[PDB]
Design an enzyme around this catalytic site. Structure first.
Site, mmCIF file in Angstrom:
data_model
loop_
_atom_site.group_PDB
_atom_site.id
_atom_site.type_symbol
_atom_site.label_atom_id
_atom_site.label_comp_id
_atom_site.label_asym_id
_atom_site.label_seq_id
_atom_site.Cartn_x
_atom_site.Cartn_y
_atom_site.Cartn_z
ATOM 1 N N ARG A 150 -5.252 8.604 2.674
ATOM 2 C CA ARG A 150 -6.045 8.657 3.899
ATOM 3 C C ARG A 150 -6.373 10.110 4.228
ATOM 4 O O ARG A 150 -5.473 10.948 4.323
ATOM 5 C CB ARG A 150 -5.323 7.991 5.066
ATOM 6 C CG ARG A 150 -6.156 7.868 6.337
ATOM 7 C CD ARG A 150 -7.379 7.000 6.132
ATOM 8 N NE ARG A 150 -7.010 5.682 5.635
ATOM 9 C CZ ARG A 150 -7.606 5.074 4.614
ATOM 10 N NH1 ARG A 150 -8.621 5.651 3.989
ATOM 11 N NH2 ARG A 150 -7.204 3.872 4.240
ATOM 12 N N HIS A 155 -12.282 4.601 8.982
ATOM 13 C CA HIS A 155 -11.354 4.588 10.103
ATOM 14 C C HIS A 155 -11.815 5.521 11.189
ATOM 15 O O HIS A 155 -12.075 6.697 10.934
ATOM 16 C CB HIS A 155 -9.953 5.010 9.664
ATOM 17 C CG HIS A 155 -9.378 4.143 8.595
ATOM 18 N ND1 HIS A 155 -9.723 4.284 7.275
ATOM 19 C CD2 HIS A 155 -8.503 3.117 8.660
ATOM 20 C CE1 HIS A 155 -9.079 3.367 6.564
ATOM 21 N NE2 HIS A 155 -8.324 2.662 7.381
ATOM 22 N N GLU A 189 0.830 -1.190 0.000
ATOM 23 C CA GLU A 189 0.000 0.000 0.000
ATOM 24 C C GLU A 189 0.871 1.248 0.000
ATOM 25 O O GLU A 189 1.617 1.499 0.945
ATOM 26 C CB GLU A 189 -0.945 0.021 1.206
ATOM 27 C CG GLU A 189 -1.779 1.291 1.288
ATOM 28 C CD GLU A 189 -2.503 1.457 2.631
ATOM 29 O OE1 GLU A 189 -3.742 1.665 2.615
ATOM 30 O OE2 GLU A 189 -1.829 1.387 3.692
ATOM 31 N N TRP A 190 0.785 2.044 -1.054
ATOM 32 C CA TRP A 190 1.500 3.308 -1.036
ATOM 33 C C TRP A 190 0.580 4.372 -0.443
ATOM 34 O O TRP A 190 -0.489 4.657 -0.987
ATOM 35 C CB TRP A 190 1.980 3.698 -2.443
ATOM 36 C CG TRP A 190 2.600 5.045 -2.488
ATOM 37 C CD1 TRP A 190 3.199 5.714 -1.457
ATOM 38 C CD2 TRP A 190 2.663 5.923 -3.621
ATOM 39 N NE1 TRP A 190 3.639 6.939 -1.882
ATOM 40 C CE2 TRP A 190 3.320 7.091 -3.207
ATOM 41 C CE3 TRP A 190 2.224 5.824 -4.947
ATOM 42 C CZ2 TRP A 190 3.548 8.158 -4.068
ATOM 43 C CZ3 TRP A 190 2.453 6.877 -5.796
ATOM 44 C CH2 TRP A 190 3.112 8.030 -5.360
ATOM 45 N N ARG A 191 0.968 4.936 0.694
ATOM 46 C CA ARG A 191 0.159 5.980 1.314
ATOM 47 C C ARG A 191 0.459 7.354 0.704
ATOM 48 O O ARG A 191 1.495 7.950 0.970
ATOM 49 C CB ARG A 191 0.377 6.004 2.830
ATOM 50 C CG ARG A 191 -0.291 4.847 3.588
ATOM 51 C CD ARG A 191 -1.780 5.073 3.775
ATOM 52 N NE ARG A 191 -2.037 6.322 4.486
ATOM 53 C CZ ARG A 191 -2.064 6.446 5.813
ATOM 54 N NH1 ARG A 191 -1.848 5.386 6.590
ATOM 55 N NH2 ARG A 191 -2.306 7.632 6.362
ATOM 56 N N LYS A 226 -13.510 -2.408 4.348
ATOM 57 C CA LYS A 226 -12.501 -2.276 5.377
ATOM 58 C C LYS A 226 -12.914 -1.291 6.468
ATOM 59 O O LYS A 226 -13.468 -0.230 6.187
ATOM 60 C CB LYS A 226 -11.170 -1.834 4.755
ATOM 61 C CG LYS A 226 -10.080 -1.486 5.752
ATOM 62 C CD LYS A 226 -8.970 -0.693 5.073
ATOM 63 C CE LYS A 226 -7.933 -0.225 6.078
ATOM 64 N NZ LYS A 226 -7.003 0.792 5.520
ATOM 65 N N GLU A 280 -9.756 10.779 9.192
ATOM 66 C CA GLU A 280 -9.679 9.349 9.487
ATOM 67 C C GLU A 280 -8.229 8.910 9.706
ATOM 68 O O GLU A 280 -7.865 7.771 9.405
ATOM 69 C CB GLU A 280 -10.341 8.533 8.364
ATOM 70 C CG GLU A 280 -11.767 9.010 8.053
ATOM 71 C CD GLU A 280 -12.616 7.993 7.295
ATOM 72 O OE1 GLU A 280 -12.162 6.848 7.069
ATOM 73 O OE2 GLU A 280 -13.758 8.343 6.938
ATOM 74 N N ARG A 328 -4.973 -8.348 14.412
ATOM 75 C CA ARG A 328 -4.149 -8.320 13.216
ATOM 76 C C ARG A 328 -3.650 -9.709 12.836
ATOM 77 O O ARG A 328 -3.108 -9.883 11.754
ATOM 78 C CB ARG A 328 -2.964 -7.378 13.401
ATOM 79 C CG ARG A 328 -3.352 -5.938 13.701
ATOM 80 C CD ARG A 328 -2.154 -5.020 13.576
ATOM 81 N NE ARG A 328 -2.453 -3.624 13.885
ATOM 82 C CZ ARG A 328 -2.914 -2.734 13.012
ATOM 83 N NH1 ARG A 328 -3.165 -3.086 11.756
ATOM 84 N NH2 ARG A 328 -3.143 -1.484 13.403
#
Lengths: 240, 240
Positions: A80, A141, A44-46, A168, A84, A211
Protein backbone atom coordinates in the site's frame (compact mmCIF):
# COMPACT_ATOMS: atom_id res chain seq x y z
CA UNK A 1 -16.04 -15.30 -10.90
CA UNK A 2 -12.29 -15.31 -10.29
CA UNK A 3 -11.25 -18.76 -9.14
CA UNK A 4 -7.99 -19.20 -7.22
CA UNK A 5 -7.05 -22.43 -5.38
CA UNK A 6 -10.70 -23.50 -5.45
CA UNK A 7 -11.77 -20.20 -3.86
CA UNK A 8 -14.58 -18.79 -6.03
CA UNK A 9 -14.31 -15.01 -5.75
CA UNK A 10 -17.45 -13.34 -7.10
CA UNK A 11 -19.83 -16.17 -6.16
CA UNK A 12 -21.92 -17.08 -3.14
CA UNK A 13 -20.84 -15.39 0.06
CA UNK A 14 -18.02 -12.79 0.19
CA UNK A 15 -14.66 -14.46 0.67
CA UNK A 16 -12.75 -13.50 3.78
CA UNK A 17 -9.29 -11.94 3.67
CA UNK A 18 -7.01 -11.67 6.67
CA UNK A 19 -4.06 -9.21 6.53
CA UNK A 20 -0.61 -9.85 7.94
CA UNK A 21 0.84 -6.51 9.05
CA UNK A 22 3.67 -7.70 11.31
CA UNK A 23 7.01 -5.94 10.62
CA UNK A 24 9.45 -8.77 11.43
CA UNK A 25 9.95 -11.87 9.32
CA UNK A 26 9.59 -14.21 12.27
CA UNK A 27 6.19 -12.82 13.21
CA UNK A 28 5.09 -12.79 9.56
CA UNK A 29 5.77 -16.53 9.29
CA UNK A 30 4.04 -17.23 12.62
CA UNK A 31 0.89 -15.37 11.54
CA UNK A 32 0.99 -17.23 8.22
CA UNK A 33 1.06 -20.53 10.06
CA UNK A 34 -1.72 -19.24 12.33
CA UNK A 35 -3.94 -18.53 9.28
CA UNK A 36 -4.20 -22.32 8.80
CA UNK A 37 -6.63 -22.48 11.71
CA UNK A 38 -8.34 -19.13 11.07
CA UNK A 39 -11.84 -19.03 9.58
CA UNK A 40 -10.80 -17.15 6.42
CA UNK A 41 -10.42 -17.88 2.73
CA UNK A 42 -7.30 -15.99 1.82
CA UNK A 43 -4.39 -14.01 3.23
CA UNK A 44 -3.04 -10.57 2.38
CA UNK A 45 0.56 -9.93 3.31
CA UNK A 46 1.03 -6.17 3.63
CA UNK A 47 4.52 -5.45 2.26
CA UNK A 48 4.72 -1.83 3.36
CA UNK A 49 4.81 -3.00 6.99
CA UNK A 50 7.77 -5.36 6.39
CA UNK A 51 10.96 -3.88 7.86
CA UNK A 52 13.17 -5.33 5.08
CA UNK A 53 10.94 -4.44 2.12
CA UNK A 54 13.75 -2.51 0.39
CA UNK A 55 15.58 -5.82 0.02
CA UNK A 56 13.58 -7.23 -2.86
CA UNK A 57 15.27 -10.67 -2.74
CA UNK A 58 14.61 -11.01 0.96
CA UNK A 59 10.98 -10.23 0.19
CA UNK A 60 10.80 -12.81 -2.63
CA UNK A 61 12.28 -15.52 -0.38
CA UNK A 62 10.12 -14.59 2.54
CA UNK A 63 7.13 -14.77 0.18
CA UNK A 64 8.09 -18.39 -0.55
CA UNK A 65 8.18 -19.31 3.15
CA UNK A 66 4.84 -17.56 3.73
CA UNK A 67 3.20 -19.51 0.90
CA UNK A 68 4.51 -22.83 2.22
CA UNK A 69 2.64 -22.23 5.50
CA UNK A 70 -0.68 -21.05 4.00
CA UNK A 71 -2.44 -24.44 3.87
CA UNK A 72 -3.31 -23.74 0.21
CA UNK A 73 -5.08 -20.44 0.89
CA UNK A 74 -4.50 -17.84 -1.85
CA UNK A 75 -1.76 -15.35 -1.11
CA UNK A 76 -2.42 -11.72 -2.01
CA UNK A 77 0.61 -9.42 -1.90
CA UNK A 78 0.09 -5.69 -1.39
CA UNK A 79 2.40 -2.73 -1.10
CA UNK A 80 0.00 0.00 0.00
CA UNK A 81 1.51 3.33 -1.03
CA UNK A 82 1.68 6.15 1.51
CA UNK A 83 -0.81 8.41 -0.31
CA UNK A 84 -3.50 5.72 0.01
CA UNK A 85 -2.90 4.81 3.67
CA UNK A 86 0.37 2.90 3.42
CA UNK A 87 3.03 2.69 6.12
CA UNK A 88 6.14 4.11 4.42
CA UNK A 89 7.51 6.47 1.80
CA UNK A 90 8.66 4.61 -1.32
CA UNK A 91 9.74 5.84 -4.75
CA UNK A 92 7.61 4.87 -7.74
CA UNK A 93 10.74 3.14 -9.14
CA UNK A 94 11.10 0.99 -6.01
CA UNK A 95 7.37 0.34 -6.07
CA UNK A 96 7.47 -1.15 -9.57
CA UNK A 97 10.91 -2.78 -9.16
CA UNK A 98 9.73 -4.73 -6.08
CA UNK A 99 6.60 -6.00 -7.81
CA UNK A 100 8.52 -7.01 -10.97
CA UNK A 101 10.88 -9.03 -8.75
CA UNK A 102 8.06 -10.77 -6.86
CA UNK A 103 6.54 -11.67 -10.22
CA UNK A 104 9.81 -13.34 -11.33
CA UNK A 105 11.06 -15.04 -8.17
CA UNK A 106 8.40 -14.62 -5.50
CA UNK A 107 5.34 -16.61 -4.48
CA UNK A 108 1.87 -15.04 -4.81
CA UNK A 109 -1.57 -15.70 -6.30
CA UNK A 110 -2.95 -12.17 -6.51
CA UNK A 111 -1.17 -8.87 -6.96
CA UNK A 112 -2.47 -5.56 -5.65
CA UNK A 113 -1.80 -2.58 -7.95
CA UNK A 114 -3.10 0.92 -7.27
CA UNK A 115 -5.21 2.34 -10.11
CA UNK A 116 -3.43 5.71 -9.82
CA UNK A 117 0.16 4.50 -10.03
CA UNK A 118 2.00 5.11 -13.26
CA UNK A 119 -0.16 3.31 -15.72
CA UNK A 120 2.43 2.69 -18.41
CA UNK A 121 4.62 1.04 -15.82
CA UNK A 122 1.63 -0.62 -14.22
CA UNK A 123 0.24 -1.96 -17.49
CA UNK A 124 3.58 -3.54 -18.39
CA UNK A 125 3.64 -5.09 -14.91
CA UNK A 126 0.06 -6.38 -15.26
CA UNK A 127 0.87 -8.42 -18.39
CA UNK A 128 4.05 -9.82 -16.83
CA UNK A 129 2.09 -10.81 -13.72
CA UNK A 130 -0.76 -12.39 -15.73
CA UNK A 131 1.70 -14.35 -17.85
CA UNK A 132 2.97 -15.83 -14.55
CA UNK A 133 -0.63 -16.80 -13.67
CA UNK A 134 -1.07 -14.07 -11.07
CA UNK A 135 -4.56 -12.53 -10.68
CA UNK A 136 -4.58 -8.75 -10.69
CA UNK A 137 -6.34 -6.59 -8.10
CA UNK A 138 -6.45 -2.96 -9.21
CA UNK A 139 -7.44 -0.76 -6.33
CA UNK A 140 -7.98 2.68 -4.93
CA UNK A 141 -8.08 4.01 -1.38
CA UNK A 142 -9.19 7.36 -0.07
CA UNK A 143 -8.63 7.50 3.69
CA UNK A 144 -9.76 11.11 4.11
CA UNK A 145 -13.12 11.34 2.37
CA UNK A 146 -15.81 9.76 0.24
CA UNK A 147 -15.95 10.77 -3.45
CA UNK A 148 -19.29 11.18 -5.18
CA UNK A 149 -21.17 8.04 -6.12
CA UNK A 150 -20.37 8.67 -9.80
CA UNK A 151 -16.66 9.06 -9.12
CA UNK A 152 -16.50 5.79 -7.15
CA UNK A 153 -18.31 4.10 -10.04
CA UNK A 154 -16.02 5.77 -12.58
CA UNK A 155 -12.94 4.62 -10.70
CA UNK A 156 -14.23 1.05 -10.46
CA UNK A 157 -15.03 1.19 -14.17
CA UNK A 158 -11.55 2.47 -15.08
CA UNK A 159 -9.93 -0.46 -13.22
CA UNK A 160 -12.03 -2.94 -15.18
CA UNK A 161 -10.99 -1.09 -18.39
CA UNK A 162 -7.35 -1.58 -17.39
CA UNK A 163 -8.04 -5.34 -17.33
CA UNK A 164 -8.21 -5.83 -13.56
CA UNK A 165 -9.20 -9.32 -12.52
CA UNK A 166 -10.70 -7.75 -9.40
CA UNK A 167 -11.60 -4.08 -8.87
CA UNK A 168 -11.30 -2.67 -5.35
CA UNK A 169 -12.02 0.67 -3.71
CA UNK A 170 -12.00 1.80 -0.10
CA UNK A 171 -13.36 5.17 0.96
CA UNK A 172 -13.56 7.00 4.27
CA UNK A 173 -17.02 8.15 5.41
CA UNK A 174 -17.42 11.40 7.31
CA UNK A 175 -21.13 10.83 8.05
CA UNK A 176 -23.89 8.23 7.39
CA UNK A 177 -24.65 9.65 3.92
CA UNK A 178 -21.11 8.82 2.74
CA UNK A 179 -21.69 5.20 3.73
CA UNK A 180 -24.83 5.11 1.63
CA UNK A 181 -22.86 6.72 -1.20
CA UNK A 182 -20.34 3.87 -1.07
CA UNK A 183 -23.04 1.17 -0.76
CA UNK A 184 -25.01 2.63 -3.71
CA UNK A 185 -21.88 3.04 -5.83
CA UNK A 186 -21.20 -0.63 -5.14
CA UNK A 187 -24.75 -1.63 -6.15
CA UNK A 188 -24.83 0.46 -9.37
CA UNK A 189 -21.37 -0.75 -10.50
CA UNK A 190 -22.23 -4.38 -9.83
CA UNK A 191 -25.63 -4.37 -11.49
CA UNK A 192 -24.81 -2.26 -14.54
CA UNK A 193 -21.09 -2.24 -15.52
CA UNK A 194 -19.19 -5.05 -13.79
CA UNK A 195 -18.20 -8.21 -15.65
CA UNK A 196 -15.42 -8.93 -13.19
CA UNK A 197 -15.68 -9.14 -9.37
CA UNK A 198 -15.56 -5.89 -7.42
CA UNK A 199 -14.55 -5.16 -3.85
CA UNK A 200 -15.68 -2.14 -1.90
CA UNK A 201 -15.73 -0.88 1.62
CA UNK A 202 -16.60 2.16 3.66
CA UNK A 203 -13.84 2.48 6.27
CA UNK A 204 -13.96 3.18 10.02
CA UNK A 205 -16.72 2.60 12.56
CA UNK A 206 -19.28 4.39 10.36
CA UNK A 207 -18.73 2.17 7.33
CA UNK A 208 -18.57 -1.14 9.20
CA UNK A 209 -21.86 -2.41 7.73
CA UNK A 210 -20.17 -2.31 4.30
CA UNK A 211 -17.95 -5.15 5.48
CA UNK A 212 -20.79 -7.63 5.98
CA UNK A 213 -23.23 -6.65 3.21
CA UNK A 214 -21.05 -7.79 0.29
CA UNK A 215 -23.49 -10.46 -0.84
CA UNK A 216 -26.38 -8.01 -0.96
CA UNK A 217 -24.71 -5.15 -2.82
CA UNK A 218 -22.10 -7.06 -4.85
CA UNK A 219 -18.79 -6.80 -3.00
CA UNK A 220 -16.86 -10.06 -3.44
CA UNK A 221 -14.15 -9.70 -0.76
CA UNK A 222 -14.19 -8.47 2.82
CA UNK A 223 -11.19 -7.86 5.08
CA UNK A 224 -11.01 -9.11 8.65
CA UNK A 225 -8.29 -8.64 11.25
CA UNK A 226 -14.20 -6.93 12.62
CA UNK A 227 -12.31 -10.13 13.45
CA UNK A 228 -12.36 -12.98 10.95
CA UNK A 229 -14.51 -15.30 13.15
CA UNK A 230 -17.22 -12.68 13.76
CA UNK A 231 -17.11 -11.87 10.08
CA UNK A 232 -17.98 -15.36 8.86
CA UNK A 233 -20.79 -15.55 11.42
CA UNK A 234 -22.12 -12.15 10.41
CA UNK A 235 -21.95 -13.03 6.72
CA UNK A 236 -24.06 -16.11 7.33
CA UNK A 237 -26.66 -14.10 9.28
CA UNK A 238 -27.06 -11.62 6.43
CA UNK A 239 -26.78 -14.34 3.77
CA UNK A 240 -29.23 -14.20 0.85
CA UNK B 1 -36.79 11.59 22.26
CA UNK B 2 -39.83 9.79 23.65
CA UNK B 3 -39.14 8.71 27.22
CA UNK B 4 -41.39 5.92 28.43
CA UNK B 5 -40.67 4.01 31.67
CA UNK B 6 -37.03 5.17 31.43
CA UNK B 7 -36.63 3.81 27.92
CA UNK B 8 -35.24 6.77 25.98
CA UNK B 9 -36.54 6.21 22.47
CA UNK B 10 -34.59 8.34 20.01
CA UNK B 11 -31.25 8.36 21.87
CA UNK B 12 -28.23 6.06 21.99
CA UNK B 13 -28.69 2.64 20.41
CA UNK B 14 -31.97 1.46 18.80
CA UNK B 15 -34.37 0.06 21.40
CA UNK B 16 -35.46 -3.54 20.90
CA UNK B 17 -39.13 -4.51 20.57
CA UNK B 18 -40.25 -8.10 21.04
CA UNK B 19 -43.68 -8.89 19.60
CA UNK B 20 -46.23 -11.14 21.20
CA UNK B 21 -48.10 -12.96 18.41
CA UNK B 22 -49.52 -15.95 20.33
CA UNK B 23 -53.24 -16.54 19.61
CA UNK B 24 -54.40 -17.72 23.09
CA UNK B 25 -54.55 -15.62 26.26
CA UNK B 26 -52.72 -18.38 28.15
CA UNK B 27 -49.71 -18.22 25.81
CA UNK B 28 -49.88 -14.43 25.57
CA UNK B 29 -49.48 -14.23 29.35
CA UNK B 30 -46.74 -16.89 29.18
CA UNK B 31 -44.82 -14.81 26.66
CA UNK B 32 -45.26 -11.60 28.65
CA UNK B 33 -43.71 -13.25 31.69
CA UNK B 34 -40.97 -14.71 29.46
CA UNK B 35 -40.07 -11.19 28.24
CA UNK B 36 -38.92 -10.38 31.81
CA UNK B 37 -35.73 -12.34 31.05
CA UNK B 38 -35.45 -11.50 27.36
CA UNK B 39 -32.81 -8.98 26.32
CA UNK B 40 -35.28 -6.38 25.02
CA UNK B 41 -36.53 -2.92 25.93
CA UNK B 42 -40.20 -3.19 25.21
CA UNK B 43 -43.02 -5.45 24.08
CA UNK B 44 -45.52 -5.18 21.25
CA UNK B 45 -48.69 -7.22 21.67
CA UNK B 46 -50.15 -7.92 18.25
CA UNK B 47 -53.90 -7.75 18.85
CA UNK B 48 -54.79 -9.04 15.37
CA UNK B 49 -53.33 -12.43 16.25
CA UNK B 50 -55.55 -12.78 19.36
CA UNK B 51 -58.47 -15.20 18.96
CA UNK B 52 -60.78 -13.08 21.18
CA UNK B 53 -59.79 -9.64 19.85
CA UNK B 54 -63.45 -9.05 18.95
CA UNK B 55 -64.36 -9.12 22.66
CA UNK B 56 -63.19 -5.62 23.54
CA UNK B 57 -63.67 -6.04 27.30
CA UNK B 58 -61.70 -9.28 27.19
CA UNK B 59 -58.87 -7.47 25.42
CA UNK B 60 -58.87 -4.61 27.94
CA UNK B 61 -58.61 -7.06 30.85
CA UNK B 62 -56.02 -9.23 29.17
CA UNK B 63 -53.91 -6.16 28.45
CA UNK B 64 -54.05 -5.40 32.20
CA UNK B 65 -52.74 -8.88 32.95
CA UNK B 66 -50.03 -8.61 30.29
CA UNK B 67 -48.86 -5.32 31.80
CA UNK B 68 -48.51 -6.77 35.27
CA UNK B 69 -46.08 -9.36 33.85
CA UNK B 70 -43.83 -6.96 31.88
CA UNK B 71 -41.30 -6.04 34.59
CA UNK B 72 -41.95 -2.36 33.82
CA UNK B 73 -41.14 -2.65 30.11
CA UNK B 74 -43.30 -0.31 27.96
CA UNK B 75 -46.25 -2.04 26.37
CA UNK B 76 -47.01 -1.15 22.77
CA UNK B 77 -50.42 -2.31 21.59
CA UNK B 78 -50.89 -3.00 17.90
CA UNK B 79 -53.77 -4.03 15.71
CA UNK B 80 -52.23 -4.46 12.25
CA UNK B 81 -54.91 -4.27 9.57
CA UNK B 82 -55.15 -6.85 6.80
CA UNK B 83 -54.23 -4.41 4.02
CA UNK B 84 -50.96 -3.75 5.85
CA UNK B 85 -49.98 -7.35 6.62
CA UNK B 86 -52.33 -8.04 9.53
CA UNK B 87 -53.81 -11.40 10.49
CA UNK B 88 -57.55 -10.81 10.12
CA UNK B 89 -60.38 -8.97 8.41
CA UNK B 90 -61.73 -6.23 10.68
CA UNK B 91 -64.15 -3.33 10.07
CA UNK B 92 -62.97 0.27 10.36
CA UNK B 93 -65.63 0.80 13.05
CA UNK B 94 -64.39 -2.10 15.16
CA UNK B 95 -60.84 -0.93 14.69
CA UNK B 96 -61.56 2.48 16.27
CA UNK B 97 -64.01 1.02 18.81
CA UNK B 98 -61.35 -1.46 20.03
CA UNK B 99 -58.69 1.23 20.52
CA UNK B 100 -61.16 3.57 22.23
CA UNK B 101 -62.00 0.95 24.89
CA UNK B 102 -58.31 0.22 25.40
CA UNK B 103 -57.70 3.93 25.91
CA UNK B 104 -60.39 4.01 28.67
CA UNK B 105 -60.07 0.60 30.32
CA UNK B 106 -56.93 -1.04 28.97
CA UNK B 107 -53.28 -0.96 29.98
CA UNK B 108 -50.73 0.29 27.40
CA UNK B 109 -47.90 2.76 27.04
CA UNK B 110 -47.76 3.22 23.29
CA UNK B 111 -50.54 2.93 20.74
CA UNK B 112 -49.99 1.94 17.12
CA UNK B 113 -52.23 3.81 14.68
CA UNK B 114 -51.90 3.43 10.92
CA UNK B 115 -51.46 6.63 8.87
CA UNK B 116 -54.04 5.62 6.29
CA UNK B 117 -56.92 4.81 8.63
CA UNK B 118 -59.85 7.22 8.67
CA UNK B 119 -57.95 10.31 9.70
CA UNK B 120 -60.84 12.20 11.35
CA UNK B 121 -61.64 9.17 13.53
CA UNK B 122 -57.94 8.67 13.93
CA UNK B 123 -57.26 12.23 15.10
CA UNK B 124 -60.06 12.09 17.68
CA UNK B 125 -58.58 8.85 19.00
CA UNK B 126 -55.08 10.34 19.10
CA UNK B 127 -56.06 13.19 21.45
CA UNK B 128 -57.96 10.81 23.75
CA UNK B 129 -54.97 8.45 23.95
CA UNK B 130 -52.57 11.34 24.64
CA UNK B 131 -54.86 12.72 27.33
CA UNK B 132 -54.48 9.30 28.98
CA UNK B 133 -50.69 9.70 28.67
CA UNK B 134 -50.33 7.18 25.85
CA UNK B 135 -47.58 7.71 23.24
CA UNK B 136 -48.80 7.53 19.65
CA UNK B 137 -47.04 5.50 16.98
CA UNK B 138 -48.34 6.52 13.56
CA UNK B 139 -47.31 3.90 11.04
CA UNK B 140 -47.40 2.49 7.52
CA UNK B 141 -46.65 -0.95 6.14
CA UNK B 142 -46.23 -2.07 2.56
CA UNK B 143 -45.66 -5.83 2.55
CA UNK B 144 -45.37 -6.23 -1.21
CA UNK B 145 -43.20 -3.33 -2.49
CA UNK B 146 -40.97 -0.38 -1.70
CA UNK B 147 -42.34 3.08 -2.66
CA UNK B 148 -39.94 5.77 -3.93
CA UNK B 149 -37.50 7.37 -1.48
CA UNK B 150 -39.51 10.61 -1.72
CA UNK B 151 -42.82 8.89 -0.92
CA UNK B 152 -41.38 7.09 2.12
CA UNK B 153 -40.09 10.44 3.37
CA UNK B 154 -43.43 12.10 2.54
CA UNK B 155 -45.32 9.45 4.51
CA UNK B 156 -42.95 9.88 7.44
CA UNK B 157 -43.42 13.65 7.28
CA UNK B 158 -47.21 13.27 7.09
CA UNK B 159 -47.12 11.09 10.23
CA UNK B 160 -45.18 13.78 12.08
CA UNK B 161 -47.66 16.45 10.88
CA UNK B 162 -50.52 14.44 12.38
CA UNK B 163 -48.81 14.81 15.79
CA UNK B 164 -47.27 11.31 16.05
CA UNK B 165 -44.94 10.74 18.98
CA UNK B 166 -43.12 8.18 16.85
CA UNK B 167 -43.19 7.72 13.05
CA UNK B 168 -42.85 4.24 11.62
CA UNK B 169 -42.75 2.68 8.18
CA UNK B 170 -42.02 -0.85 7.01
CA UNK B 171 -41.59 -1.59 3.30
CA UNK B 172 -40.92 -4.74 1.26
CA UNK B 173 -37.76 -4.91 -0.88
CA UNK B 174 -37.70 -6.88 -4.09
CA UNK B 175 -33.97 -6.28 -4.66
CA UNK B 176 -30.89 -4.60 -3.13
CA UNK B 177 -31.75 -1.24 -4.64
CA UNK B 178 -34.99 -1.22 -2.64
CA UNK B 179 -33.12 -1.71 0.64
CA UNK B 180 -30.88 1.28 -0.12
CA UNK B 181 -33.97 3.31 -0.97
CA UNK B 182 -35.36 2.60 2.51
CA UNK B 183 -32.03 3.22 4.24
CA UNK B 184 -31.65 6.50 2.29
CA UNK B 185 -35.21 7.57 3.02
CA UNK B 186 -34.47 6.96 6.71
CA UNK B 187 -31.29 9.04 6.61
CA UNK B 188 -32.95 11.94 4.77
CA UNK B 189 -36.00 12.02 7.06
CA UNK B 190 -33.82 11.91 10.15
CA UNK B 191 -31.36 14.56 9.07
CA UNK B 192 -33.64 17.09 7.35
CA UNK B 193 -37.24 16.78 8.65
CA UNK B 194 -37.46 14.72 11.84
CA UNK B 195 -38.24 16.40 15.14
CA UNK B 196 -39.64 13.23 16.69
CA UNK B 197 -38.18 9.70 16.67
CA UNK B 198 -38.64 7.64 13.52
CA UNK B 199 -38.65 3.88 12.98
CA UNK B 200 -37.92 2.31 9.61
CA UNK B 201 -37.33 -1.12 8.18
CA UNK B 202 -36.92 -3.03 4.97
CA UNK B 203 -38.68 -6.38 5.42
CA UNK B 204 -37.51 -9.91 4.62
CA UNK B 205 -34.08 -11.46 4.21
CA UNK B 206 -32.94 -8.75 1.76
CA UNK B 207 -33.61 -5.87 4.17
CA UNK B 208 -32.30 -7.57 7.32
CA UNK B 209 -29.42 -5.06 7.59
CA UNK B 210 -31.88 -2.22 8.20
CA UNK B 211 -32.72 -3.92 11.51
CA UNK B 212 -29.21 -3.39 12.91
CA UNK B 213 -28.33 -0.02 11.35
CA UNK B 214 -30.75 2.19 13.28
CA UNK B 215 -28.08 4.17 15.09
CA UNK B 216 -26.20 4.95 11.87
CA UNK B 217 -29.19 6.06 9.74
CA UNK B 218 -31.67 7.31 12.36
CA UNK B 219 -34.09 4.45 13.12
CA UNK B 220 -35.06 4.53 16.82
CA UNK B 221 -36.67 1.08 17.18
CA UNK B 222 -35.93 -2.39 15.84
CA UNK B 223 -38.10 -5.49 16.18
CA UNK B 224 -36.83 -8.98 16.99
CA UNK B 225 -38.76 -12.21 17.53
CA UNK B 226 -33.49 -11.74 14.02
CA UNK B 227 -34.00 -12.95 17.60
CA UNK B 228 -33.69 -10.49 20.50
CA UNK B 229 -30.47 -12.15 21.73
CA UNK B 230 -28.71 -11.75 18.37
CA UNK B 231 -30.10 -8.26 17.82
CA UNK B 232 -28.59 -6.61 20.87
CA UNK B 233 -25.21 -8.23 20.18
CA UNK B 234 -25.40 -6.96 16.60
CA UNK B 235 -26.42 -3.45 17.66
CA UNK B 236 -23.38 -3.24 19.94
CA UNK B 237 -21.04 -4.37 17.15
CA UNK B 238 -22.19 -1.62 14.75
CA UNK B 239 -22.60 1.00 17.47
CA UNK B 240 -21.17 4.43 16.60
Amino acid sequence: PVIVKNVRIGEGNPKIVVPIVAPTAEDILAEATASQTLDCDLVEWRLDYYENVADFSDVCNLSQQVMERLGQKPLLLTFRTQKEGGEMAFSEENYFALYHELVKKGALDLLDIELFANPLAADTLIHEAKKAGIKIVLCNHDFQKTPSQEEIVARLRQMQMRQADICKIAVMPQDATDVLTLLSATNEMYTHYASVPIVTMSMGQLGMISRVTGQLFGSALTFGSLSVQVLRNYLKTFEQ
